[PDB]
Scaffold this active site. Structure first.
Site, PDB file in Angstrom:
ATOM      1  N   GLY A   1      -4.778   5.723 -10.985  1.00  0.00           N
ATOM      2  CA  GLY A   1      -5.766   4.784 -10.483  1.00  0.00           C
ATOM      3  C   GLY A   1      -5.566   4.387  -9.032  1.00  0.00           C
ATOM      4  O   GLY A   1      -5.923   3.270  -8.631  1.00  0.00           O
TER       5      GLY A   1
ATOM      6  N   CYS B   1      -5.718   3.373  -5.373  1.00  0.00           N
ATOM      7  CA  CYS B   1      -6.822   2.591  -4.833  1.00  0.00           C
ATOM      8  C   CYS B   1      -7.753   3.460  -4.008  1.00  0.00           C
ATOM      9  O   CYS B   1      -7.320   4.202  -3.120  1.00  0.00           O
ATOM     10  CB  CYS B   1      -6.290   1.436  -3.975  1.00  0.00           C
ATOM     11  SG  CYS B   1      -5.282   0.264  -4.870  1.00  0.00           S
TER      12      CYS B   1
ATOM     13  N   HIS C   1      -9.978  -4.682   0.234  1.00  0.00           N
ATOM     14  CA  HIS C   1      -8.638  -5.234   0.405  1.00  0.00           C
ATOM     15  C   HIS C   1      -7.719  -4.329   1.233  1.00  0.00           C
ATOM     16  O   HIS C   1      -6.544  -4.660   1.417  1.00  0.00           O
ATOM     17  CB  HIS C   1      -8.022  -5.584  -0.955  1.00  0.00           C
ATOM     18  CG  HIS C   1      -7.521  -4.422  -1.742  1.00  0.00           C
ATOM     19  ND1 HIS C   1      -8.180  -3.957  -2.856  1.00  0.00           N
ATOM     20  CD2 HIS C   1      -6.401  -3.674  -1.623  1.00  0.00           C
ATOM     21  CE1 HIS C   1      -7.506  -2.949  -3.371  1.00  0.00           C
ATOM     22  NE2 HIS C   1      -6.425  -2.749  -2.637  1.00  0.00           N
TER      23      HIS C   1
END
Lengths: 300, 300
Positions: A143, A145, A41
């Site tokens: 977290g 990406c 993404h």
């Protein structure tokens, strides 16, 4: 004494982290040999994320649209392909710091270290567990990406996780290094529900053994239980069922402490039913479940 | 969401760790340029540790009695000297992995990362705080002799701590990299008492701000307090006094959240006086004090 949650030394992974940018989207990638791995993404804008057609999006991109930076060194992308939910960027230079490594897919309840990175540069390292519902707890930076999870076995880095998404509930989801999500999640903006998050029973028992080794003994009793009778209480408190295989891997800790596994289960049953009554174990007022039996052995 | 206790990436320190052995005693050393730093009690046997005369002991040792191993490479010691409680071993090879670095002495209540090593090889990394009584909490492995504490500022490793001793109470004591102990401790086997361990108030407030940023808000109230009135309650619960300098460094977090510092102090006062009533903050049933205001800003 105390008993700290330790992560693996991160040096072998630090040398593999890079920054990947497609337009206004920047995230972290993993540079191994002549390939950069990152979440697919990166090719999406915020408005594409509702219902992206990743193959069509990937076709409109050219190699020069992927800006890869290793520290302050720009790499030249010479190819691009997609494996499940991971983008693979071909570069013209093998990473001279590539460690020995493997790609592995881990089981719920197992632990690993995460090297949290911000726009390609390592920021911090922490130890965590894959929850039984295949989520990871942590903050946005925790977290970020493209940051990866790993274990180290002797000389080899075993990469097991890559952060992809933060669910609307503030927990994280991600993939193995072949691009397959853990759990029922997809890389789209959809209200996605996770399953029931249970407590990792075998890990709690491992931590109780660590507490005994380090001098905490007030929760031990002279009571006994069977495995079935314990599991009836466990289910009431949203603890995972304990299996005979779990009993087996606690054997080394039972041998060291002289406390049979089912006796420690009788101690845990009493803690679940009565609480701690204002006391602590290893400095905690809650039962901790992010240490596996193997983690405790390595550190005790 | 959650908020993890992150350590600094350890790669720059991993390349400096070595094994130092004198007879039956083995511990960890730090290899920077052509010097290996390690605790001076490597030259002692278990029976020397009651009342060692370190200078006389050091005189009976020759360079070849110090066995230094960097991974599976033996280094050649060409000199030996003692600076306070740290031994300095001169070697014939500069460490090619020497990072940019400084030696600093930190204040009680500040945080740092520890690379825990076993006989020269890195084992794990964790984040901790120097307690107000100048001890460090952790297990035997967590504080394995010669392992070092550090912060990373941009490109430079700031070494601030080296583990030397485990006190009879199971907590750890150590030195700065110039060999000066933190706190009133000495490298001898003597029942050594630590002072009262207080809670690091400014760090608890920083963590409450982190909780608000990550969505936890139930502990906020519409009450107010003065600084003196807060400190009267703090002292009752063994919390350090809050100073105006502490208020000042919480400013960025107050600005981000819209909660004045003394308003967060009124929230903390209520938590101390009434407890949490079975609720949690950031997944904890206890107030956490190993995040400084700067730590929270870096991660939020």
């Amino acid at each position: 004494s105390g008993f700290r949650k330790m992560a693996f030394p991160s040096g072998k992974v630090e040398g593999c982290m890079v920054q990947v940018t497609c337009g206004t989207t920047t995230l972290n990638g993993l540079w191994l040999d002549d390939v950069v791995y990152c979440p697919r993404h990166v090719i999406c804008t915020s408005e594409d994320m509702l219902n992206p057609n990743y193959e069509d999006l990937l076709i409109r991109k050219s190699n020069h649209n992927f800006l890869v930076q290793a520290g302050n060194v720009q790499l030249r992308v010479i190819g691009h392909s997609m494996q499940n939910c991971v983008l693979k960027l071909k570069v013209d230079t093998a990473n001279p710091k590539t460690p020995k490594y493997k790609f592995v897919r881990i089981q719920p309840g197992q632990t690993f270290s995460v090297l949290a990175c911000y726009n390609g540069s390592p920021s911090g390292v922490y130890q965590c567990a894959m929850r039984p519902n295949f989520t990871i707890k942590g903050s946005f930076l925790n977290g970020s990406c493209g940051s990866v999870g790993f274990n180290i076995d002797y000389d080899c880095v075993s990469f097991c996780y890559m952060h992809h998404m933060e669910l609307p509930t503030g927990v994280h989801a991600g993939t193995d290094l072949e691009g397959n999500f853990y759990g029922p999640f997809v890389d789209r903006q959809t209200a996605q529900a996770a399953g029931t998050d249970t407590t990792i029973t075998v890990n709690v028992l491992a931590w109780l053994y660590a507490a005994v080794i380090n001098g905490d003994r007030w929760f031990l009793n002279r009571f006994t239980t069977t495995l079935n009778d314990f599991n009836l209480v466990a289910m009431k408190y949203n603890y995972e069922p304990l299996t005979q295989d779990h009993v087996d891997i606690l054997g080394p800790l039972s041998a060291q402490t002289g406390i049979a596994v089912l006796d420690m289960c009788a101690s845990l049953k009493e803690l679940l039913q009565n609480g701690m009554n204002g006391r602590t174990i290893l400095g905690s007022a809650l039962l901790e479940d992010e240490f596996t039996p193997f983690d405790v052995v390595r550190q005790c």
